[model samples]
Target: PLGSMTQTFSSKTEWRVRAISAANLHLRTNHIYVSETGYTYILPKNVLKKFICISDLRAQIAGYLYGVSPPDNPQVKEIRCIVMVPQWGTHQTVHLPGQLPQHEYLKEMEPLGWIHTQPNESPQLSPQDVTTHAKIMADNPSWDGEKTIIITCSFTPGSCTLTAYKLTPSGYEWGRQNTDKGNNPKGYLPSHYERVQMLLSDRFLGFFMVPAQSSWNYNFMGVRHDPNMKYELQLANPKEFYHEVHRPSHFLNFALL
Candidate 1:
């Protein structure tokens, strides 16, 4: 019985690692420490769409990212984002609302990170962005600072580029020491930033068009007898659909459709 129990535990761990690796190809890196420290930030298609919509407003928007991690794995750090609570802003910055923590409804999910929109097509973090991130880290004492992320959605004429960033250990230290010193201290250097890989969950398959090299492609042509036919029909009136499906659950609940 002991041997059987050990086998079951081993199988479960292997399965978890396998699933995580599928979600993040970086797991196969030759450096073991690199694989352990590397992170995969998963964004659902609908959340990404919301970012794009906000970007179109030609302002920098900021939000809190709420999500949960999978069961613990010694070597993997993967965060799947469930929702974004946005605060509107002007051309330069987003003034995050002070009442975020007061919202009892958000307590259901752990606050994992921050996401913001860059009106222009530049993935680089501004000095203020770095400062804000440092402050966010200071506020969330329970989080593994290294595991926390900041995502930027940069907009161009016809495309939106999403980039995830985490402060390097040294960079975090530097930011903490220099911020609020009266004079605006220079933020971390480019090398002090770590870029994270972002993936869309499989449920978002139809929402995005995969490049030609990818195995999966979005089928623009409606499938016969498919339940998604109703959803496709709504595409003709995207504005109405967007207004009606404003809630985060509206997006996730579509899996039932």
Candidate 2:
């Protein structure tokens, strides 16, 4: 009877081993992972207007982009504001500050990205541009290295084009590893980066047009408030617009009362 029990136990053990093997077996398939695959960069109307003004100079201008992002996806960087640095370089290149100046207004904002102008050229990143981007990424360890972006605003005689870009994961890692490399030689970034999609805010329907100078008086100094004229319309006449208070004078009167 004991020998018969031993035979049954051996068969049961073999069955259990087969069941475990079936559970462990998994199908193998090819998977491709792309870097910055679903990232989007959003530009607001106001920032675009400012960029247009900078483009008119027909020189290289570099600036900072301040914005917020959702907690779940750091890839979507929507620009809420822009601060342009004075042109430190010539038409061919622009040197921007590695760090923005500290200000109370920027306390709540994060430096999500940067922007620069490419006058009379296409919106393609040059070797120098890639190196500069890499340098910035290396310097700012707190910033989301993979999500940070660079925007190129290429301007021509009558048209302006904006393009967004980010480094591939390998490129970002290379940047981190080689922080001292100042310049990327030609063909260095051939397969190390890719373009990003930029979405314009609904408010940015088209180019923002400034009213003709003939219609309004342009004053360098802001308009002065007239305490006596409380009910005068501010924009009834464009020529007289500068003479009117920026805010309703009645509001000031109420404060005085």
Candidate 3:
């Protein structure tokens, strides 16, 4: 158990921490944490064993995905997917309950050729990172799961607070609220102000790491709604819109073919 003085992990061993309260739940690894608010503490694994026993953790994730998804009419075969890319130098597990573990779902998705996405942002994610992750998915040899789309942003969504803090082995830090502006990354302060949620939402599904233990690095995760919805930003890139076609053109091509 985590609390045992006898417990040991490689200095390299990573942890998956979970925090829950009457109003919300949080799971974080690396230096990054995600939430509608911040500064949640790790509820001991022993404590969680009972508090979260009501249902499987995956079911909660499923509920979130399923609740927002449109009815899958024959025309909309939305096989949901969760795309997660942890930013850097950390190994973290998502904390969910019951029989639905991350590996379990990967087993079912093994045949689906886990699609990869790169948002053309800076601090490119390493090939080793993507490779090992894909290998993990491919290694899963099971085939029983449901469709759920979960896209985790590697760090918090937007601008964050900058402050110094200590570490603990148990899980989450209890001192500073995760939402406090003073907690921004790398000890850098924001120049301008905007809505907290808006800033957080402006980021992509990745992170950028900096050197030094206490120095700022960005490694937050975020979940998006309507996972299957298609979004194309015309100004985002020139080539993407070069051969743009209207919906009818796409439909026409489908009919002619």
Q: How well does each candidate superpose onto the true structure, as a TM-score?
A: 0.55, 0.56, 0.20
* Candidates 1 and 3, the one with greater TM-score: 1
Best TM-score goes to which candidate? 2
lDDT per residue (tens digit) for residues 1-257 in model 1: 44745433332433234234323322212111111237666676654554444232344655456665556753333343323222335455555432333233444556557777666655466656666666656655744567777777765444456677877776666665655532245655765567776665545322221112211101111122232221111111122112322333545666787
Tens digit of lDDT per residue, candidate 2, span 1-257? 55745543332434235334323222100110111447677777555654544332333556667776656877676676665432244456665544543444556767767777665555356555666777677777655655667777765344455677877765665554453434444346556678878777745322221122222111211132121212211111121121233224535666897
In terms of lDDT, the best-performing candidate is 2
Cα-based lDDT for every prediction: 0.47, 0.51, 0.22
Q: Distance from true position, residue 177, model 2, in Å?
A: 8.4
How close to the true structure is residue 175 of candidate 3, measured as C-alpha lDDT? 16
lDDT of 3: 0.22
| The 10-residue segment with the lowest total lDDT in model 1 | 232-241
lDDT of 3 by residue, 12-84 (tens): 3121212122112232221232232122111122211122221112112111111111245332222223222
Off by over 4 Å in 3: 1-69, 74-123, 142-152, 156-257
CA lDDT, candidate 1, residue 157: 41
Candidates in order: C-alpha RMSD to true structure: 21.6, 28.6, 23.7
| Count of backbone clashes, every candidate in sequence | 0, 0, 22
lDDT at residue 193 of model 2 (Cα atoms):
73
Q: Sorted on TM-score, highest at the top, how do the candidates line up?
A: 2, 1, 3
